[PDB]
Short mmCIF file of N, CA and C and ligand atoms in Angstrom, two decimals:
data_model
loop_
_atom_site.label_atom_id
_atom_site.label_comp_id
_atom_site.label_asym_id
_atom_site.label_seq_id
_atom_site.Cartn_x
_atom_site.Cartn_y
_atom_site.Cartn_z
N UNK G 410 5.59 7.98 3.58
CA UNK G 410 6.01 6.59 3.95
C UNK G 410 5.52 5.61 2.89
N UNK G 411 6.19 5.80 1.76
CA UNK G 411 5.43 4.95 0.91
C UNK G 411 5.88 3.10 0.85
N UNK G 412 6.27 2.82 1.92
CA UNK G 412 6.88 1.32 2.02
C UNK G 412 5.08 1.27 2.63
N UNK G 413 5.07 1.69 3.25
CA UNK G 413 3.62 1.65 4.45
C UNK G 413 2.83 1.52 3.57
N UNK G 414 2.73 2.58 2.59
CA UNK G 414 1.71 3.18 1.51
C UNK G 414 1.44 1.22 0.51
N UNK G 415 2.94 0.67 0.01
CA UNK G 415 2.68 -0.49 -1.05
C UNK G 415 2.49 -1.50 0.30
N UNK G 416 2.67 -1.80 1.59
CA UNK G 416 2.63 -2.51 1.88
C UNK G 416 0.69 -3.03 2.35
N UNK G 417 0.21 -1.87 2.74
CA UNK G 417 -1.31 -1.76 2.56
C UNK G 417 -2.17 -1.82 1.62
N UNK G 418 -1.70 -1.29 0.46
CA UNK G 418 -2.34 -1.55 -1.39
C UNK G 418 -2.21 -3.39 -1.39
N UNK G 419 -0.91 -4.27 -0.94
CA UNK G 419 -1.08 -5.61 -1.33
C UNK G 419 -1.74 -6.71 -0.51
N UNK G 420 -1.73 -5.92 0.79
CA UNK G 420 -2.48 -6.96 2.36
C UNK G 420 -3.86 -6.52 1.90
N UNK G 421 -4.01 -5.38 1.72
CA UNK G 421 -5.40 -5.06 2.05
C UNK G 421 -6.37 -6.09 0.48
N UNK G 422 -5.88 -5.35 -0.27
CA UNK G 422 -6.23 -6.06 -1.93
C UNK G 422 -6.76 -8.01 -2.09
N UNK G 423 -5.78 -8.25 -0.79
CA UNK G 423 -5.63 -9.59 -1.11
C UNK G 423 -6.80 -10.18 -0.07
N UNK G 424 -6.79 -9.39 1.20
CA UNK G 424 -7.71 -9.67 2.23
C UNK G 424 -9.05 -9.45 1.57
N UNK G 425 -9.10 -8.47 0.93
CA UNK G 425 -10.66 -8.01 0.32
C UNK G 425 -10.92 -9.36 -0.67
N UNK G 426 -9.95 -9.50 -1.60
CA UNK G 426 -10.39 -10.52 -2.59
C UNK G 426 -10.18 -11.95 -2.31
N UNK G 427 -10.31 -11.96 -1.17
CA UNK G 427 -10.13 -13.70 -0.18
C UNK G 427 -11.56 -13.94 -0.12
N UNK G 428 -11.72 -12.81 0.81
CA UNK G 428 -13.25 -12.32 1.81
C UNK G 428 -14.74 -12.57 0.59
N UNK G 429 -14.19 -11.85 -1.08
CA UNK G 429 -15.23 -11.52 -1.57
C UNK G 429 -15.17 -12.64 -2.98
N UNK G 430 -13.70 -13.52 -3.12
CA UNK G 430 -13.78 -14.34 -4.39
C UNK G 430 -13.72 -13.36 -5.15
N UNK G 431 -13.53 -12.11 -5.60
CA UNK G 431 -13.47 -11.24 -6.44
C UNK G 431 -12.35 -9.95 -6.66
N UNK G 432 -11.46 -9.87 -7.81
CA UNK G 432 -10.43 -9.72 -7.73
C UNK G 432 -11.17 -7.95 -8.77
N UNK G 433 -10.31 -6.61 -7.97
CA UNK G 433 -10.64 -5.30 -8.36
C UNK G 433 -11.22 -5.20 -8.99
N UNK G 434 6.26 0.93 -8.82
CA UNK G 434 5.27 0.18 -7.75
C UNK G 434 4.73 -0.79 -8.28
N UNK G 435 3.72 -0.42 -8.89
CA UNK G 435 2.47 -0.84 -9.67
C UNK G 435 3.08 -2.07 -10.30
N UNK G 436 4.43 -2.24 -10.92
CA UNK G 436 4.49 -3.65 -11.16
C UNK G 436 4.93 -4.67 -9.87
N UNK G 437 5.76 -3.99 -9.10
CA UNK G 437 6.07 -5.00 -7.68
C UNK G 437 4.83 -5.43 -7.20
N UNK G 438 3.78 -4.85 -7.01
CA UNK G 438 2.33 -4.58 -6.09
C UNK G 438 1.95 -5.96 -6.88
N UNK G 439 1.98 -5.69 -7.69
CA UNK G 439 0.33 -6.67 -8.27
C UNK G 439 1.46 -8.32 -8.63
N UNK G 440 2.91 -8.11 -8.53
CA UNK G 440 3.32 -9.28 -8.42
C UNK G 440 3.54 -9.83 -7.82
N UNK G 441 3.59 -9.29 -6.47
CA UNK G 441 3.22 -9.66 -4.92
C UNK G 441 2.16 -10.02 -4.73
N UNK G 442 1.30 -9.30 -5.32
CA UNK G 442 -0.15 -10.21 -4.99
C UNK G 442 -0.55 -11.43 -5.34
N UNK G 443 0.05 -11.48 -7.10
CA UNK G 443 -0.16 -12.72 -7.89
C UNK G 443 0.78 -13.77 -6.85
N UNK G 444 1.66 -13.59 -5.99
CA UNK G 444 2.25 -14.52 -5.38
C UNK G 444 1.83 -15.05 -3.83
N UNK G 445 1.03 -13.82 -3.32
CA UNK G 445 0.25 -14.39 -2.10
C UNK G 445 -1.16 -15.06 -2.75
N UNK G 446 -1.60 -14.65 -3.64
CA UNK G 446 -2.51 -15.44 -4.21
C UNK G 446 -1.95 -16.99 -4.22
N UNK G 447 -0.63 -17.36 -4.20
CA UNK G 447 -0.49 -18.55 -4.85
C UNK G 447 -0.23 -19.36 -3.56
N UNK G 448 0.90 -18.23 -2.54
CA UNK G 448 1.95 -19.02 -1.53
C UNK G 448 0.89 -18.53 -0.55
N UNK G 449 -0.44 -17.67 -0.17
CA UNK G 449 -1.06 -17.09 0.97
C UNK G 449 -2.41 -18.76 0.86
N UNK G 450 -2.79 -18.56 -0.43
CA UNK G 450 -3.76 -20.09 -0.69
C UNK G 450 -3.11 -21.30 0.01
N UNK G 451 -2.25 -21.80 -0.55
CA UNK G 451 -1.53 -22.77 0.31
C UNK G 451 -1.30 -22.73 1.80
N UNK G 452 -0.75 -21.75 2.24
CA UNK G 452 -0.80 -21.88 3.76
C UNK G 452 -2.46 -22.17 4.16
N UNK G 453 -2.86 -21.46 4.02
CA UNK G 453 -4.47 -21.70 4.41
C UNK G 453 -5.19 -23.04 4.16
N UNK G 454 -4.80 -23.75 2.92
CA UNK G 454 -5.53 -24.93 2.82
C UNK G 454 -4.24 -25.93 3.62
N UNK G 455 -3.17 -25.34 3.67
CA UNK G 455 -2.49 -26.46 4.44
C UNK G 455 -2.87 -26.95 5.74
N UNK G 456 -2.85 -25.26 6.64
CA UNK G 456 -2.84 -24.57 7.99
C UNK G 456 -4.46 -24.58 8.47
N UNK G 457 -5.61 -25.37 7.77
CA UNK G 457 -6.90 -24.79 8.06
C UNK G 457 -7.17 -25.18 9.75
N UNK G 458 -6.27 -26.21 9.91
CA UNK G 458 -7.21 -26.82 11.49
C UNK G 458 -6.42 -25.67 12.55
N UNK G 459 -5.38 -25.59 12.19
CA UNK G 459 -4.64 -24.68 13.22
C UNK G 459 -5.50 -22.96 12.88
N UNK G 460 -5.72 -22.59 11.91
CA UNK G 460 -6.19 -21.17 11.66
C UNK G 460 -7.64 -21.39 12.79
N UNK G 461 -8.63 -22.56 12.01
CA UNK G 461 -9.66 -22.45 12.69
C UNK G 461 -9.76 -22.71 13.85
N UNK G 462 -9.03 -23.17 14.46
CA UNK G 462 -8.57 -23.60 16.08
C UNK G 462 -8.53 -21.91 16.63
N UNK G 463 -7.38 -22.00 16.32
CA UNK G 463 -7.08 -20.33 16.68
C UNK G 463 -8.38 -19.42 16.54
N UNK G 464 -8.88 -18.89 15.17
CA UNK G 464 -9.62 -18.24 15.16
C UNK G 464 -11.07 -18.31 16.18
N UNK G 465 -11.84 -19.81 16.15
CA UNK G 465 -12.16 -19.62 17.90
C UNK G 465 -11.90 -19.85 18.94
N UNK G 466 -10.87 -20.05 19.09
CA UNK G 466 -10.50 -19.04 20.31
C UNK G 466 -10.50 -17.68 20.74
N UNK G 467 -10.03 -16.79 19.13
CA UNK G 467 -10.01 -15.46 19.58
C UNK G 467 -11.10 -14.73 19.71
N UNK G 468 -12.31 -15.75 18.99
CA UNK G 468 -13.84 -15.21 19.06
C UNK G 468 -13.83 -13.53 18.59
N UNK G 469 -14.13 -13.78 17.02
CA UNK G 469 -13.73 -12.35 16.81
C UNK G 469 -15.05 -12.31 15.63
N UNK G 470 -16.24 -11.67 16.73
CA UNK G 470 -17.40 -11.07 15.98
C UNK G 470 -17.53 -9.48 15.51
N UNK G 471 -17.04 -9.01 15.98
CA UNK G 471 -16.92 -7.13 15.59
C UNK G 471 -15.73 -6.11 15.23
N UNK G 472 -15.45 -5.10 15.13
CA UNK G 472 -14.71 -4.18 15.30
C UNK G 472 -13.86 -3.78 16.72
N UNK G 473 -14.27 -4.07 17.88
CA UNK G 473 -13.55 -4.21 18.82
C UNK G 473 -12.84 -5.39 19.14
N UNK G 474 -13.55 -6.42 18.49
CA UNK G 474 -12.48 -7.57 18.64
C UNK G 474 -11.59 -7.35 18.05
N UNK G 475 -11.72 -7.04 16.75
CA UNK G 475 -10.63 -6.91 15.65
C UNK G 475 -9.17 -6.09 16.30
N UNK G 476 -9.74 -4.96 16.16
CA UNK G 476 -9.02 -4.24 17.14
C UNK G 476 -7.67 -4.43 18.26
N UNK G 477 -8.36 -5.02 19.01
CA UNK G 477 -7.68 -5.46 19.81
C UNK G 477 -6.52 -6.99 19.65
N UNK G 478 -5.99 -7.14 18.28
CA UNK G 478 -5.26 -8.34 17.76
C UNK G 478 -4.40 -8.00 17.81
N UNK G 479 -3.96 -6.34 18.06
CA UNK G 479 -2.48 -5.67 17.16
C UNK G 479 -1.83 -6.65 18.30
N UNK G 480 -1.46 -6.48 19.49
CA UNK G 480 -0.87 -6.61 20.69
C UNK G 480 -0.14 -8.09 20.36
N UNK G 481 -1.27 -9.30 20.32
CA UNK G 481 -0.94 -10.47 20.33
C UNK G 481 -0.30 -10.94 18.68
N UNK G 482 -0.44 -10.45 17.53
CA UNK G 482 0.00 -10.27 16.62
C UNK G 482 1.09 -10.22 16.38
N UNK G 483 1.82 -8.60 17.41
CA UNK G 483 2.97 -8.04 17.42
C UNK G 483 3.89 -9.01 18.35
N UNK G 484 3.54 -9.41 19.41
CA UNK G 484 3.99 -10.33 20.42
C UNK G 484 4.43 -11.30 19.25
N UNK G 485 3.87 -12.25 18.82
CA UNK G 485 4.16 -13.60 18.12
C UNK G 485 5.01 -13.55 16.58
N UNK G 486 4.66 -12.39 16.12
CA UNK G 486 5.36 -12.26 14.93
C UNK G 486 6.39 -11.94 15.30
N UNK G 487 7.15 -10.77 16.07
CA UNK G 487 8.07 -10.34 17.01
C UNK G 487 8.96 -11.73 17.89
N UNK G 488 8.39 -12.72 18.06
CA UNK G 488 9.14 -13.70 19.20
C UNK G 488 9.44 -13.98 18.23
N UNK G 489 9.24 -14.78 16.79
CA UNK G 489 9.89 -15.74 16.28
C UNK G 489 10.96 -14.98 15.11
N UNK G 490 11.75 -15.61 14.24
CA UNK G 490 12.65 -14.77 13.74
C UNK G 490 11.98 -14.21 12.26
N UNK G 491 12.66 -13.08 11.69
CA UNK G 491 11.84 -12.91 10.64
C UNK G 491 12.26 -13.21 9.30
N UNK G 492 11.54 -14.01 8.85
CA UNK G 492 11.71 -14.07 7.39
C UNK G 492 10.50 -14.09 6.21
N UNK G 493 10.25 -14.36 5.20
CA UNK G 493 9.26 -14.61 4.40
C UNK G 493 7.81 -15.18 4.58
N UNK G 494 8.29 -16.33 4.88
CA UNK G 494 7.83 -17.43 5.09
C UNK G 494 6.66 -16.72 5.97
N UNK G 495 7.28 -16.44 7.55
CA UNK G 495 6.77 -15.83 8.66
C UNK G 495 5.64 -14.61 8.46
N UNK G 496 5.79 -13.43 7.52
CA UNK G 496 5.54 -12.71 6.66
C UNK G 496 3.94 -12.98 6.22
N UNK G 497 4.31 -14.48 5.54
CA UNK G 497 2.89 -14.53 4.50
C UNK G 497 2.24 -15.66 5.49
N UNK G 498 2.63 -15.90 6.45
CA UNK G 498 1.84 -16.97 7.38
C UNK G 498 0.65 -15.83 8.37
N UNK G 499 1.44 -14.54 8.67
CA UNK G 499 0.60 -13.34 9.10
C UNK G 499 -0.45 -12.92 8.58
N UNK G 500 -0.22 -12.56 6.87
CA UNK G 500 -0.64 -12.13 5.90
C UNK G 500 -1.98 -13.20 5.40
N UNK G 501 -1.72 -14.37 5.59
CA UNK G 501 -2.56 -15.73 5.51
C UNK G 501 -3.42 -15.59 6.25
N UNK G 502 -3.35 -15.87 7.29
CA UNK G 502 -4.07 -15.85 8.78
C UNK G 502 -5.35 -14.62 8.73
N UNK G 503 -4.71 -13.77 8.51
CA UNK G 503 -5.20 -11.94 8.21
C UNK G 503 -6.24 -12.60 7.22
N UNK G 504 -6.22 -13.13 6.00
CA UNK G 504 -6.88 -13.42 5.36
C UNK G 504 -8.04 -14.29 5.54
N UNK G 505 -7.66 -15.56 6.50
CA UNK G 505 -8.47 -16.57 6.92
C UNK G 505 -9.47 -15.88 7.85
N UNK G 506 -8.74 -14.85 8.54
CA UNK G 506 -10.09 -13.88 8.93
C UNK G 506 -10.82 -13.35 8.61
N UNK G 507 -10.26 -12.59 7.55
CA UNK G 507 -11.14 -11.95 6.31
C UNK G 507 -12.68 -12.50 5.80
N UNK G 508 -12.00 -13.96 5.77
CA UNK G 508 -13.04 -14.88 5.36
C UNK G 508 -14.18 -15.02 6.22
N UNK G 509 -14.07 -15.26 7.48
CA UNK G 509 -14.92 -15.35 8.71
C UNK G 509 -15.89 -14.04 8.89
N UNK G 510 -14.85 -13.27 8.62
CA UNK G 510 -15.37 -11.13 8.94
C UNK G 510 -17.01 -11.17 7.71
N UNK G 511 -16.22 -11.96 6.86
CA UNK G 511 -17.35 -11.29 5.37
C UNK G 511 -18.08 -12.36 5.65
N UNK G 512 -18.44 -13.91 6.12
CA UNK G 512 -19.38 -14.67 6.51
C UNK G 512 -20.26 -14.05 7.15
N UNK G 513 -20.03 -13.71 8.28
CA UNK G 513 -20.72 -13.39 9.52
C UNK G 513 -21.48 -11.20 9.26
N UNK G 514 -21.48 -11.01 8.21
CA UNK G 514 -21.79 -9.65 7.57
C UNK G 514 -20.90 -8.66 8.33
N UNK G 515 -19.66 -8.38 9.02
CA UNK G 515 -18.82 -8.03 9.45
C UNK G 515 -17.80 -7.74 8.30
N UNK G 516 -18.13 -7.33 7.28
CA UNK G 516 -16.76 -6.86 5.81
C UNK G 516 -16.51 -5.67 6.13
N UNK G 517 -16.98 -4.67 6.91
CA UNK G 517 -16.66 -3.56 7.18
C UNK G 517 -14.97 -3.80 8.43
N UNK G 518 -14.46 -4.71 9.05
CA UNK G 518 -13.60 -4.92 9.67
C UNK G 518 -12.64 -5.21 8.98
N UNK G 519 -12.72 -5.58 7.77
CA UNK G 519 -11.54 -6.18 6.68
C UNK G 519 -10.36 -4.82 6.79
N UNK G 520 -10.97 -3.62 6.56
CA UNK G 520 -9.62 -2.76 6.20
C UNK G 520 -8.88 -2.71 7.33
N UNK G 521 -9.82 -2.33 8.43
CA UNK G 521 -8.85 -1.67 9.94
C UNK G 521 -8.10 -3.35 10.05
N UNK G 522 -8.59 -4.53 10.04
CA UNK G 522 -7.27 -5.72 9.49
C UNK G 522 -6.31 -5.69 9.22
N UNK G 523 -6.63 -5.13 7.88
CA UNK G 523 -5.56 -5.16 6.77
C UNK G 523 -4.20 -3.90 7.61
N UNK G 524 -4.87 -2.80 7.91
CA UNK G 524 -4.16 -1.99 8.51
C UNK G 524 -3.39 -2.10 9.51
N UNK G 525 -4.33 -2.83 10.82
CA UNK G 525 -3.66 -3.48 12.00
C UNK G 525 -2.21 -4.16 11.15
N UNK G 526 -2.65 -5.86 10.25
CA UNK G 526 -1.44 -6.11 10.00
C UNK G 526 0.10 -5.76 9.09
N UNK G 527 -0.79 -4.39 8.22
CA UNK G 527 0.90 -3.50 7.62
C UNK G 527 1.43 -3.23 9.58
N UNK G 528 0.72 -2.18 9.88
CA UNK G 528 1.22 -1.80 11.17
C UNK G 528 2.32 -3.02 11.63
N UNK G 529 1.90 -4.16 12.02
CA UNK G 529 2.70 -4.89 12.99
C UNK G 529 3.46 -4.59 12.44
N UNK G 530 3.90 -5.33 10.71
CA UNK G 530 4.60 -5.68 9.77
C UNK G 530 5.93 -4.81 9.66
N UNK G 531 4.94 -3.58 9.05
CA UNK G 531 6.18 -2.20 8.90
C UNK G 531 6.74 -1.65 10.29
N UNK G 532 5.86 -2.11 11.36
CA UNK G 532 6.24 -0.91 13.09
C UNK G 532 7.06 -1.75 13.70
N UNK G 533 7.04 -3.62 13.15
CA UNK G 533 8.33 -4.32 14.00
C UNK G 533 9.72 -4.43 13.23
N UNK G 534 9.67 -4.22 11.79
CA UNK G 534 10.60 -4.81 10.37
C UNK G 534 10.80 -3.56 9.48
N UNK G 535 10.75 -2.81 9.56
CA UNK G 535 10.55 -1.85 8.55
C UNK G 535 11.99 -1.69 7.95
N UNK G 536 13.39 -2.03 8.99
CA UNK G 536 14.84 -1.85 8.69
C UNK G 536 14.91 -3.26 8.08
N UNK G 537 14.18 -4.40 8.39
CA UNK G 537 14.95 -5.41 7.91
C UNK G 537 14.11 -5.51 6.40
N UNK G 538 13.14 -4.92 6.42
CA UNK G 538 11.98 -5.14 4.97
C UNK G 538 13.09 -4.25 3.94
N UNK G 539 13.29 -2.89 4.68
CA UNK G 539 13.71 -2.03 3.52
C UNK G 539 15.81 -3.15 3.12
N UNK G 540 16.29 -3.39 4.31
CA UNK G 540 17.50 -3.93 3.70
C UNK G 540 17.08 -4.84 2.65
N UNK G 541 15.91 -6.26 2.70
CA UNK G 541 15.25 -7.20 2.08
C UNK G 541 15.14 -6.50 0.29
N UNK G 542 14.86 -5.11 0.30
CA UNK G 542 14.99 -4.30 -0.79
C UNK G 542 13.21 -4.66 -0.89
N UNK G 543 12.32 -4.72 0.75
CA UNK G 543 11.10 -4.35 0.46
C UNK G 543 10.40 -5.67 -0.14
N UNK G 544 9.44 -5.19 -1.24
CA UNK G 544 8.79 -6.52 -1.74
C UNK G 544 9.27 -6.71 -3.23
N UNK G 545 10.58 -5.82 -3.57
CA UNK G 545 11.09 -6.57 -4.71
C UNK G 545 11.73 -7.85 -4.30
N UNK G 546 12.25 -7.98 -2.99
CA UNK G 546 12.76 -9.28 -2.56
C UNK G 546 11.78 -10.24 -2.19
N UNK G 547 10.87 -9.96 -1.74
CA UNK G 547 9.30 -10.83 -1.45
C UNK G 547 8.96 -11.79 -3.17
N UNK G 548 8.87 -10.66 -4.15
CA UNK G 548 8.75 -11.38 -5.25
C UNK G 548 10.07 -11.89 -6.24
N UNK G 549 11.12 -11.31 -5.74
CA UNK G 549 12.58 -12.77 -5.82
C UNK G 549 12.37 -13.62 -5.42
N UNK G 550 12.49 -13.75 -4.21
CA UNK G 550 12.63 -14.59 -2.58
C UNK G 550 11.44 -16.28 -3.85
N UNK G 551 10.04 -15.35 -3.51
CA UNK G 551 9.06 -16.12 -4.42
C UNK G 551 8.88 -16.99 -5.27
N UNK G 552 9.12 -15.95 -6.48
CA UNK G 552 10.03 -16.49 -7.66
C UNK G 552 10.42 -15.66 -8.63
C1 LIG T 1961 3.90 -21.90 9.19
O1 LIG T 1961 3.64 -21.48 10.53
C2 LIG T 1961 2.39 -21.61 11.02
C3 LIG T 1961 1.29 -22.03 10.30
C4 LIG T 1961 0.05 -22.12 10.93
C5 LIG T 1961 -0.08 -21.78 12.26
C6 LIG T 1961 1.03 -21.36 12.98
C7 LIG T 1961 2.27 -21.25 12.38
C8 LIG T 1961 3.47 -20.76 13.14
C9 LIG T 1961 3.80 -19.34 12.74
O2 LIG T 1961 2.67 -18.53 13.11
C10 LIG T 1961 2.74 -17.22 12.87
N1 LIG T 1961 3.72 -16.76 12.13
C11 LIG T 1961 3.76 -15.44 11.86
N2 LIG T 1961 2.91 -14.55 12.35
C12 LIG T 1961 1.94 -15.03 13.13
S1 LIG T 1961 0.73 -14.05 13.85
C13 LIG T 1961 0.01 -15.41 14.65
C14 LIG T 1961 -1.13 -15.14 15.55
C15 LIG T 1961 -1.30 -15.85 16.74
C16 LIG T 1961 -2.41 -15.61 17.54
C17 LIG T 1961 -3.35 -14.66 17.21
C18 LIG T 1961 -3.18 -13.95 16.05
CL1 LIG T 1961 -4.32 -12.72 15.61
C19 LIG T 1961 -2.09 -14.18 15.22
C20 LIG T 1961 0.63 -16.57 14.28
C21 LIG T 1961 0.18 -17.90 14.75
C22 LIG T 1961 0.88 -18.54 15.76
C23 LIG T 1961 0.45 -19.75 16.27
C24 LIG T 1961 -0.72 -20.34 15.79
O3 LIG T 1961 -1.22 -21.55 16.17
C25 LIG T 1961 -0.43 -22.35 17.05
C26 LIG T 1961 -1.06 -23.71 17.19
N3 LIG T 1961 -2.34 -23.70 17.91
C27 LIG T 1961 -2.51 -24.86 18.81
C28 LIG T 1961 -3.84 -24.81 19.53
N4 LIG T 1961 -4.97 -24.73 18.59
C29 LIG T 1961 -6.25 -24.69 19.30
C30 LIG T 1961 -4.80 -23.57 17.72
C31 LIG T 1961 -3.49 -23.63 16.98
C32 LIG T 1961 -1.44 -19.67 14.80
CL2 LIG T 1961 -2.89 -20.43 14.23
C33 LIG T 1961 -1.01 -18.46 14.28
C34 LIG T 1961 -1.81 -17.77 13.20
C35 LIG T 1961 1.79 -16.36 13.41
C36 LIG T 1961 5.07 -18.91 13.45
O4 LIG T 1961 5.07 -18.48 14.63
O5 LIG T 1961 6.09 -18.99 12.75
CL1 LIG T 1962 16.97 -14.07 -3.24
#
């Protein structure tokens, strides 16, 4: 399943180097990244009161919290329609957690994250990602 396979190399990559300020197919991958780097930053400094609103609420100190996000994740990404945009607002969010996970000495939760959100990603979209032609259209779509 290698859609699964690039879609985890660019969530996960980007969540780690949110979390840590520190940066590490192969050409789609890393130009997807250079673009959530650009369009995932922006949502976050746009979106901060709504992320941090949200985020306590969901009160998410451990590995079982984490855990338990797929559900409400899948619910909300799933209700609304899918496009890009929607995509890297997930992917954002995922990240803004990231940030919180590696504050609080919790960096060990970053991957099963990153994983939870390919899962939603690829287990609700996987027909409309692959028609999209995947993340060569993510980095069209982009720029
Ligand atoms: C540009 O769109 C933004 C930007 C910032 C916040 C909300 C949205 C709507 C967007 O949200 C999402 N789009 C795609 N996937 C997801 S997944 C998800 C979510 C939802 C709950 C839990 C978890 Cl783990 C994830 C949200 C999403 C959904 C809603 C959200 O906030 C709604 C506004 N509340 C009001 C009350 N306040 C205390 C907290 C913020 C937020 Cl912050 C998010 C991240 C979301 C979309 O659905 O297109
Ligand atoms: Cl296009």
């Amino acid at each position: 399943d290698e859609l699964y396979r690039q879609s985890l190399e660019i969530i996960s990559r980007y969540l780690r180097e949110q979390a840590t300020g520190a940066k590490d197919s192969g050409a789609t991958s890393r130009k997807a990244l250079e673009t959530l780097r650009r369009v995932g930053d922006g949502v976050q400094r746009n979106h901060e009161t709504a992320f941090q609103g949200m985020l306590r609420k969901l009160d998410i100190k451990n590995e079982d919290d984490v855990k338990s996000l797929s559900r409400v994740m899948i619910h909300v990404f799933s209700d609304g329609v899918t496009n890009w945009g929607r995509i890297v607002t997930l992917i954002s969010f995922g990240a803004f957690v990231a940030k919180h996970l590696k504050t609080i000495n919790q960096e060990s939760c970053i991957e099963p994250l990153a994983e939870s959100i390919t899962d939603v990603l690829v287990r609700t979209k996987r027909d409309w990602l692959v028609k999209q032609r995947g993340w060569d259209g993510f980095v069209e779509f982009f720029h």
